[PDB]
Amino acid sequence: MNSFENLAQDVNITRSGKTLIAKGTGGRSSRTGYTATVFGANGFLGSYLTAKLAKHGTTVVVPYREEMAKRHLK
Amino acid sequence: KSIISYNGNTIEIPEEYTKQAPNRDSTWAPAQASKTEIYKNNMVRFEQKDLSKQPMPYAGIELIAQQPVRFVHGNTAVCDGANHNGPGAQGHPKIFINVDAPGSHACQYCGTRYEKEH
Amino acid sequence: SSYPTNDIAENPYWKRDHRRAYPQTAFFDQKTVTGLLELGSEATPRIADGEAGTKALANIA
Amino acid sequence: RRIMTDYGFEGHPLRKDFPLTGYTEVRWDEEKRRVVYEPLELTQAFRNFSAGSTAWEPVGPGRDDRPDSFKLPTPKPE
Amino acid sequence: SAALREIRFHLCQNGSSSAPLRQFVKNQIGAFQKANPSTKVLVREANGVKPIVFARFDHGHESKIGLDVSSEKEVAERVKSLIEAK
Amino acid sequence: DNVPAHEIVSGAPAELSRNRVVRIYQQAKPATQSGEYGTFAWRLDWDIVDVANRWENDLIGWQSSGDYMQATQMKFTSKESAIKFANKQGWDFYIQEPHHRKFRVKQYANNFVHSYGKLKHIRTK
Amino acid sequence: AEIELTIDGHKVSIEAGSALIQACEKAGVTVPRYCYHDKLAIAGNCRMCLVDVERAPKPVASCAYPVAPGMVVRTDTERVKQARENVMEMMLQNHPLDCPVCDQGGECDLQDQSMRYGRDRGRFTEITGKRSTEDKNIGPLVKTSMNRCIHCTRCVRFANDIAGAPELGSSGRGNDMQIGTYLEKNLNTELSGNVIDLCPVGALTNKPYAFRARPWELKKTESIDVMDAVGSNIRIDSKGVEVMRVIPRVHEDVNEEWINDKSRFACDGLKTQRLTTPLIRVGDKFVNATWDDALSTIAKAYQQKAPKGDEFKAVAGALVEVESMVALKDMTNALGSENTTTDTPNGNSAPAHGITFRSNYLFNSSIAGIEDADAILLVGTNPRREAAVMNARIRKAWLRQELEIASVGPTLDATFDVAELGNTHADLEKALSGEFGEVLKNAKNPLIIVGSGITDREDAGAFFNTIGKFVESTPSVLNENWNGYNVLQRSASRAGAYDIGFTPSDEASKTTPKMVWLLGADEVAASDIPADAFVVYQGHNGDVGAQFADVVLPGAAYTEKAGTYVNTEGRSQISRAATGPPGGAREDWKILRAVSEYLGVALPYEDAYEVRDRLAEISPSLVRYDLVEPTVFGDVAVQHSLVGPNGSVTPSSAPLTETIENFYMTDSISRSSPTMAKSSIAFNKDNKKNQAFA
Amino acid sequence: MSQVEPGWHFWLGYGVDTAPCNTPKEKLPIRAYPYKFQPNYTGTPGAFVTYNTLKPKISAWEPVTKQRS
Amino acid sequence: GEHALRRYPSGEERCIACKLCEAICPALAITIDAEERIDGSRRTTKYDIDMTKCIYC
Amino acid sequence: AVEKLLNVEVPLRGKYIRTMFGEITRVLNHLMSVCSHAMDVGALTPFLWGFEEREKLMEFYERVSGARLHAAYVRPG
Amino acid sequence: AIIATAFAETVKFSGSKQELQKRTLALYRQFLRGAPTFADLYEVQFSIPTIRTKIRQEFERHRFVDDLSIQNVLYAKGHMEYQECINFWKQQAQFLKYFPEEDDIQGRHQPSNFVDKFLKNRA
Amino acid sequence: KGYSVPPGETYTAIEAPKGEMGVYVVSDGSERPYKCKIRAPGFAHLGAFDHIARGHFLPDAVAIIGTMDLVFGEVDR
Amino acid sequence: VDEVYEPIVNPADRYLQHVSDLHQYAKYIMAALPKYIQGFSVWKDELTL
Ligand SMILES: NC(=O)C1=CN([C@@H]2O[C@H](COP(=O)(O)OP(=O)(O)OC[C@H]3O[C@@H](n4cnc5c(N)ncnc54)[C@H](OP(=O)(O)O)[C@@H]3O)[C@@H](O)[C@H]2O)C=CC1
Ligand code: SF4
Ligand code: SF4
Ligand code: SF4
Ligand code: SF4
Ligand code: FES
Ligand SMILES: [Zn+2]
């Protein structure tokens, strides 16, 4: 099976008070519970970071300027 | 209306779009999610979007309550939601509703209500 | 529709249930064919009468 | 050699113990810049609906259509 | 090893190997309980198991020795050895 | 022993051989129906693994799964064939034996027998 | 004695006097049916079992025609097929086209037998239409759409014969004959839900499940019924993560096609008020937390508090597995404690009947032995609220046999004539050495059924000493062929608990605890746990025990784990997981293993096989699944445990009180049910719908 | 083409010989709600946002605390 | 072509959650959930079609 | 195949419809095949001539079944 | 006729372990000789020694099998894979299924004891 | 549930426009097939490509693929 | 057309003579190769060896 290699646990509480219960084994259809916002996701490091975050179902919000530079992130 | 998010922040949505339908504010079933619960759990996908143009159809629970009761002379009322204006069946199966009891009684396919002339 | 199937009086379904009148799949091992050979068939019998033919069949079974 | 299946496919699909969806799936990994084979996760799980099979026997025994030349002979009673 | 705190006897109900242990439980169980008044004596049967005794001393340390012998006396000496070899 | 290890040539994953458990059982006669055709076949089904069985999707609410054997159900003619196949594929199994109804004589006349004493109960039909 | 007959050429043999349909079932010949059921009396009203007998000119009913020697039956020929077609024509004459809106769709005998044995199209086109019938209100559990009634009389026969509810009947005459209560009344019984399963049509349906699912959508898992120590065998029907319904399963030695209403309708509580994440008490509030943080807090509490010996208390409640209790006991003993305890009123002290021999806390005259019964004594038990299916069995025996039943306890609205003769220990001894004692002595299969509420008294030794003396004094109650000393348990975990030795020392009985781990334990009173103690609730629903707790660990319910459950008889049964547990919940023995490792100990097993081996090491009967064992030490047990150490106890004169003040709302899953709440408001004797003025 | 009102989308397409201008009153559908024609809004903020009309099947416990009296 | 849920001239919705469309669908594109409405009617709370699964049959 | 297993007889009108449309389908297949063979060998114009006739027959498919290509029209029975 | 491809081998089930021994050793030799070709054809980011290490690992996996027919099937499938690799039929994507070790470390938390798996719900 | 087909098996074929198209069905008495193999006419023809195209130049292979009339849904199924 | 007339006929009745022929044919094959043919089976113009 797949695994959540990024998480140490499946019940994670944020510093703002949100309870995040991970759903699944750790694949595409899995969800960590986390939401993220990567502000330079179009670029060189940001692409790899968003890939690693969304591999396990972290909801990435990608702010973008050029509609065409971002398409490879979907 | 302002909806408190799970991360502690506020989600401001107008009142027109927190209604479950334009003709009903509340839910009509237990397992039905409220619009506040929908926004609170999916606002990442509603953010820059227009709520004016999303689907918001009218609820039938409130439209079938506007339809008046039908009256019959007997213990049975027969319902077949036929068109009578075009060919074919175009309705639901023919159903016979008992109406001896005091109140009104609805069909199971449509919510047309029947009474025993009293 | 067609007449003998749309009729309302002399039309029992079991007289036109062809699905449940399906033909069986006949299977013939070597035992069953030497019976047809040593003995005969219901069309051309070559078997004794009574219990004698019964255990003659049983000797092939 | 294999003719239908993928070039490194492990398993023989039409076996009854092989599941409908198989064991693996594929995606494009942006890190590795490669099509990667990973275990299976479905967003909607398969729903069989074979549990609604009829509890009553649908079709009885058939009809004997052997010819009399190939039915064994009933011995005469006496 | 501060004390015995649970004894568990296992035995078939009609097996050949368990007749000594059966006799032991029938005759001496009261004396056993009186000699060890603070223990949990648990006789538990099931068809097909070989006779055996488990002792639990302290902090969940447990010892066991099988009771396939040919006399009630052998059962008694073996149980006493397990309750002494803490 | 000396049962062949067809698991080595199956191409299947090894987690089936090492981690999973199957159940071999006859389908219980339903209480909702008096039919019995679903019975008489020996089903083989995989037990649940908790983390991968079912979870709801956050987008539209579908029930997602990670278990690739959650809808598979083999059907056999007899208990022994199922056990042989399981052992050949290297699966650990539990055999759930079937519970059949108990035979008891049933008479229509017993509904109308004579009561010498006080009537135990008044029968409708 | 068996006879011989021929059915479709096949020769078969059954006892004489048997019905023909039974012979056809033994011969593998399928015969239709709507009104025949193996457990109900024979009615011959559907006229669908018709077959051809050479003796008779007309076709005869298989359900009613007795089996005779040398009879020849045919279930194949044209007369039979035409008969079935005609009967289904008439049956579907006035039947309503409700198949889409009917909850029996997909599991309807009418549909399937119309497809198999009936016509393809109907010839009913009359302009005056079909019959109509008004819907009845018989309670919040059974929903009525009585246009669909086909007048089989299964509901009436069940309610009047098996359940003892004569309020349901057959009013009217002819085509206007209507099944129901002639006036608005409720179907007040703890077995009402089996009416839903017996009706082959959707005239009586489950109300909380009313339109939730269809049968083909459902995974069907064969599992075991907690909510009572009967161990009723059930089929859990699941749609993904949601458990939709629970229906019975055939086990002729346990529950015999039936389950009670709690077992059927408390499934609504597995999806509300559940524990999905760990919680830490920071004050008056609970704060959601991780698993590492909660187990860290538990370890820090253990090290801050330093509980010496028996100051660590382990409480196990109803609905708990055996694996969980074994792990909790191993942990509690590795931490140096022997204060394993049950959630009963007198759980801090060991049982008066002792746990040395299994015969002392089990139903030794097994559930199929009630059928053998000639005399029964009920001491401190209402079997209608404790093991209602066993009450149905007692009735079944009483209706067909000479069975004389007495009771010492509260006067109980029974489904049989019960001959009440006291409420005190004085009256028990009076009865046992007076008249009913000789009734028991002269009997060939006498039963003395003692309740667990007796164990929940202080003066329980007085009782068990009296009953033990009477047992060892009377041969008929204890022979080499029959043991009549029976203890009826009301919760599903007590037998396994006593099997593994989950009872406290008397050294621990008098200790005030410093840490209290309470596992599925919702019956605590707020007086049994000190105010200054660190408490750890482990369960699946937040009802009582989690309110008290300082740390809450979410666990798995019986629908979410494959556990071992020991029933009253001593029958070990294995469940099966229908779903996985919700959220961040876990299997409970895994929780105890993890928290062991967080503490200064560690259990020696790591997966379920090693836990099974540990169960075998504790008691090998816990892995002989579904086998009810005899015992060779009945005499020894009654002499050692019941009579010996209990002579010192003096009896009270406090009257015996009923143990289960509400059959509904008995445990966490039921007290979290809204359906049980509705069924507790309704089905109250103070309501006019539940009492017929006879 | 999404801007073409229904009825005309069928007439334009040679489905019906009569336009919805010249259709009889009885062939027209009866509506108890106001008709709102909205074309395809893909590529815009008015694109349809899908969601779950249900709530979670398993309801969790809202923790409330009690004191040991 | 594109799918649609119809109403009666009442305005009430025709669907009654019988789940025959969910059952016959070869692509398993339909997903349905239902319960008892507040007015006692058999009506759906969930009706979803994945067009990317549907075959338009 | 399923009718041979079911032992049911299709009516005469259904047989005639199946035959007529099987030959319409044969016309469609040959219009694709011959005029793609031509295109691959180099003749471009027959493809575009024949595909209009394909459209004219696809309209009959659509009028009988509702689909231009995948009719799901001829069924068991 | 329909002639075989480049490195095809007719399916011939040995009736002896001693002959299948030689066949397996020859196949091992062929894999080792072809590993440079596997590194050139598939744009491989790692050593030829690594490829040979992987070959040896996959040949050790089935070292203690004793049923002859299972060994015959394994030899046949090994030759199938050799023909699929040496003739450039596979792509890099399928060839690198054998090499999950060479791809970078999959995250931080990879459980190997009980409490890890418990906190991650894998016990 | 569907209609339940009698148990058995059949290979039946038609003169499809591509050739002899066949279906080997097995019925287990159930509503679902136990086995359905499609004998596609293009499978055999593309298998015969090796025998037919040997000795030819590449422009002729195009004509051979075109006269086999190869759609690959049927080849690969 | 006022009334459509279609007789009720069993589709298997069309095969009976051919079925007998296949039976005889299979008997010949079984008698020619008794070392090899374990059985034969016949259903609706389909002979299996
Ligand atoms: N790459 C390197 O070698 C090093 C990088 N860094 C830093 O690490 C980060 C990595 O960026 P890198 O990996 O270099 O790839 P990029 O630098 O190409 O990433 C640049 C990102 O910044 C966004 N951006 C730039 N200017 C603006 C602006 N004015 N408004 C909004 N968005 C803007 C770009 O959006 P768009 O694509 O729309 O322009 C793009 O997403 C940067 O902070 C960089 O300074 C530090 C040391 C070395
Ligand atoms: S009872 Fe059966 S036949 Fe009658 S409406 Fe319901 S599903 Fe249909
Ligand atoms: S209500 Fe249901 S069970 Fe009772 S007679 Fe009518 S159909 Fe039968
Ligand atoms: S569930 Fe499907 S088939 Fe049933 S009424 Fe609704 S749309 Fe129609
Ligand atoms: S594929 Fe489309 S037309 Fe066919 S069942 Fe699914 S939704 Fe309906
Ligand atoms: S089963 Fe005999 S008449 Fe109903
Ligand atoms: Zn209606």
I32 vs I21: CA distance, rounded Å? 9
Residue with structure tokens 């001393």?
E57
Centroid of ligand 3 to alpha carbon of G203 (angstroms): 6
Q: How far is the CA of G198 from the centre of ligand 3 (A)?
A: 8
Give yes or no for B108 touching I (CB within 8 A): yes
- The answer for L 2-61 residues in CB contact with C (under 8 A) is 6, 8
Pick the residue from chain B with its C-alpha nearest to G131. Answer: B96
What distance in Å separates the CA atoms of residue K115 and residue G295, rounded to the nearest whole number?
Answer: 11
Q: Minimal Cα distance from A57: which residue of F?
A: F58
Cβ atoms of G643 and G469 closer than 8 Å: yes
CA distance F37 to G373: 36
The one-letter amino acid code at K60 reads E
Distances (CA, A) of K53 to B53, G690, K45, K60, K71: 61, 80, 15, 10, 21
The domain total for chain K is 1
Beta strands in G196-338 (DSSP E): 204-206, 219-224, 233-239, 242-248, 279-281, 286-288, 312-316
Q: Would the CB atoms of A24 and F15 count as touching at under 8 Å?
A: no
| Chain B residue numbers touching H38 (CB-CB < 8 A) | 53
Rg over alpha carbons for chain C, rounded to the nearest Å, is 21
CA-nearest residue for atom 4, ligand 4, is: I18
> At A11, is the secondary structure helix, strand, or coil?
strand
Strands (E), G225-317: 233-239, 242-248, 279-281, 286-288, 312-316
- Sign, Cα dihedral of L41, L46, L52, L53: positive
Q: How far apart are CA K53 and CA K51, in angstroms?
A: 5
CA separation for the pair F42, F26 (Å, rounded): 5
Could you tell me which chains touch chain L, where touching means 3 or more CB pairs under 8 A? Answer: C, D, J, K, M
Query: Which residues of A contribute to the annotated binding site?
Result: 42, 44-45, 65
* Both structure tokens of B72: 């019959």
Residue A44 CB less than 6 A away from ligand 1: yes
Which residue spans within I1-57 are E strands per DSSP? 30-36, 42-49
CA distances from L1 to G186, G217, G238, L5 (A): 36, 12, 19, 12
Q: How many domains is chain F partitioned into structurally?
A: 1
Quote the distance between the C-alpha of residue G411 and its chain's center. Answer: 23
- Nearest listed ligand to the Cα of residue I49: 5
Q: Are B81 and B91 in contact (CB under 8 A)?
A: yes
H-state helical runs in chain I: 21-24
Contacts of G435 (CB under 8 A, 6+ apart): none
Six-digit token string for G131 = 């019959």
Say how many CB pairs under 8 Å bridge G and K.
Answer: 24
**Beta-carbon separation of H33 and B57 below 8 A:** yes
Nearest by Cα to G31 from C22, D60, C18: D60
Domain extent at residue K106: 1-123
| Cβ of residue I8 lying under 6 Å from some atom of ligand 5 | no
How buried is E48 (Cβ within 10 angstroms: 0-12 exposed, 13-18 middle, 19+ buried)?
exposed
Contacts of H68 in chain G (CB under 8 A): 526, 529-531, 548
Per the listing, tokens 């559990």 go with G141
d(C-alpha F113, C-alpha D26), whole Å: 73
Q: CA–CA separation, G667 vs G88, rounded Å?
A: 46
Spacing, Cα G85 to ligand 6 middle (Å): 14
Distance B106 CA to ligand 7 centre (A): 8
Query: For L13, how many CA atoms within 13 A lie in the half-sphere containing its CB?
Result: 14
**Contact residues of I toward D, CB < 8 A:** 23, 28, 31, 50
Look at the block and give the residue holding tokens 């059959």.
G663
Q: What is the dihedral of CA G357, G362, G366, G370, to 10 degrees?
A: 130
DSSP state of D73: P
Yes or no: say if G556 and K121 are a contact pair by the CB < 8 Å rule.
Answer: no
Torsion of CA G81, G153, G383, F100, to 10 degrees: 0
Q: What distance in Å separates the CA atoms of residue B19 and residue D38, rounded to the nearest whole number?
A: 43
Chains near D with 3+ CB pairs less than 8 A apart are A, C, F, G, I, K, L, M
Chain H interface mutation, best of G279, G547, G553, G560, highest count of H Cβ atoms under 10 Å: G547
> Which residues on chain F are in Cβ contact (under 8 Å) with K73?
9
Method: cryo-EM
Question: What does the alpha-carbon distance between residue G355 and residue G206 come to, in Å, rounded to a whole number?
Answer: 42
- Distance of CA I25 from the midpoint of ligand 5 (Å): 5
CA distance G19 to G42: 9
Give the span between the Cα atoms of M15 and F100, in whole angstroms: 44
Q: Which of H32, H49, H53 sits opposite B33 (nearest CB)?
A: H53
Which residues, other chains included, contact I52 with Cβ-Cβ below 8 Å and sequence gap of 6+? Answer: none
Going by the DSSP 8-state scheme, the letter that residue G267 receives in this structure is G
Find the helix or strand (DSSP H, E) in which K30 lies: helix K17-41
Is the shortest distance between the CB of G155 and ligand 3 below 6 Å? yes
Q: Which two tokens stand for residue J46?
A: 């027959």
Cβ-based neighbour number of residue I57 at 10 Å: 14
Run of H or E including K69? helix K68-86
- How far apart (Å, rounded) are the C-alpha atoms in residues G183 and G192? 18
Q: Are L66 and J37 in contact (CB under 8 A)?
A: yes
Contact criterion met (CB below 8 Å) for G651 and G469: no
3-state secondary structure of A18: coil
Please give the number of the atom of ligand 5 that sits closest to the Cα of I21.
5
Q: Which of L56, K116, F27, F15 is nearest to G291 (CA)?
A: K116
CB G380, CB G450: distance < 8 Å: yes
Residue G237 phi, psi dihedral angles, 5° rounding:
-105, 120
With residue K26 as reference, give the H or E element that holds it.
Answer: helix K17-41
Distance, CA D50 to ligand 2 centroid (Å)? 20
Interface probe with D: pick from A1, A2, A29, most Cβ of D within 10 Å: A29
Tokens of G66: 């007795």
d(CA G419, CA G401): 16
Q: Which residue in C39, C43, C54 is closest to D69 by CB distance? A: C43
Q: Do J9 and M12 touch (CB under 8 A)?
A: no
Q: Which residues pair with G235 in a beta bridge?
A: G222, G247
Query: What's the rounded Cα separation, in Å, for the pair D29 and A50?
Result: 11
Q: Give the ligand with the smallest distance to the CA of G215.
A: 2
Is G85 close to C8, i.e. CB distance below 8 A? no
Who among G98, G132, G135 is closest to B75 (CB)?
A: G132
Q: After which residues is chain K broken (C to N over 2.5 A)?
A: none
Ligand index nearest the alpha carbon of residue G105: 2
M44 Cα to chain L: minimum distance (Å): 9
F48, F108, F122 ranked by CB distance to G577: nearest: F48
Question: Which single residue is written with the structure tokens 């969910």?
Answer: I22
Chains that touch I (3 or more CB pairs under 8 A): B, D, F, G, H, J
Kindly give, in sequence order, each residue whose CB lies less than 8 Å from that of residue D36, ignoring residues fewer than 6 positions away.
D26, D27, D28, D29, K93
Q: Count of residues for chain L?
A: 77
Interchain CB distance below 8 Å, G577 and F35: no
Cα atoms found within 13 Å of the Cα of residue G32, Cβ hemisphere only: 29
Angle of the K17-41 helix axis to the K68-86 helix axis, nearest 10: 20
Chains G and B touch (3+ CB pairs under 8 A): yes
**Tokens representing G114?**
């119309």
Amino acid identity for residue F54 in this structure: R
Between the two ends of chain G, the Cα-to-Cα distance in Å is 44
Does any CB of chain F come closer than 8 Å to the CB of residue I52? no
At residue B113, the 3 state secondary structure works out as: strand
Strands G312-316 and G50-53: unpaired
How far does residue G201's CA lie from ligand 3's centre (Å)? Answer: 7
Chain D interface test: which of M17, M19, M45 (most D C-beta within 10 Å): M19
Strands (E) located in G374-464: 375-379, 404-408, 446-451
DSSP, res G286 = E
Pick the residue whose CA is nearest to atom 25 on ligand 1: A40
- Can you name the residues that pair with I48 across neighbouring β-strands? I31
Query: Two tokens at G4?
Result: 């011989």
Is A23 close to F55, i.e. CB distance below 8 A?
A: yes
Q: Tell me how far apart the 2 most distant CA atoms of chain H are, in Å.
A: 84
Structure tokens at G74: 């045919």
Question: Comparing C-alpha atoms, which of G399, G371, G412 is closest to residue G161?
Answer: G399
Which residues of A are part of a known binding site for NADPH? 42, 44-45, 65
Q: Is G36 in the pocket of ligand 6 (CB under 6 A)?
A: yes
Distance CA B87, CA I57 (A): 24
DSSP per position, G561-586: S--EEE-TTS-EEE---SSPPSTT--
CB contact under 8 A, K65 and F8: yes
Q: Which tokens sit at G55?
A: 């003796």
Domain ranges of chain B: 1-118
User: For residues C14 and G116, what is the distance between their CA atoms, to the nearest angstrom?
Assistant: 11
The amino acid occupying position H20 is P
Considering only residues 72 to 91 of chain F, which have any Cβ-Cβ distance to chain G shorter than 8 Å? none
Do chain H and I touch: 3 or more Cβ pairs under 8 angstroms? yes
Please state, in angstroms and rounded to a whole number, the distance separating the CA atoms of residues G229 and G567.
5
The residue among G432, G464, G470 whose CA lies nearest residue G646 is: G464
CA distances from M39 to E17, G595, K9, M18, M29 (A): 55, 66, 35, 19, 10
Residues E18 and E74: beta-carbon distance below 8 Å: no
Distances (CA, A) of A41 to A28, A45, E52: 19, 7, 68
**Contact yes or no for J47/J39 (Cβ under 8 A):** yes
Resolution of the coordinates, Å = 2.7
Q: Would you say the CB of residue A67 lies under 6 angstroms from ligand 1? A: no
The answer, yes or no, to whether any atom of ligand 5 lies below 6 A from the CB of I32, is no
Touch between chain C and chain K: 3 or more Cβ pairs under 8 Å:
no
List the single residue in G with minimal CA-CA distance to I43. Answer: G211
Q: What share of chain B is helix, strand, coil (3-state, %, to 5)?
A: 15, 20, 65
Query: Two tokens at G80?
Result: 């039979």
3-class secondary structure, M19: helix
Token code pair at residue J55: 């459209």
Which DSSP category does G227 fall into?
S
> Under a CB-based contact definition with an 8 Å cutoff, are residues G73 and G7 in contact?
yes
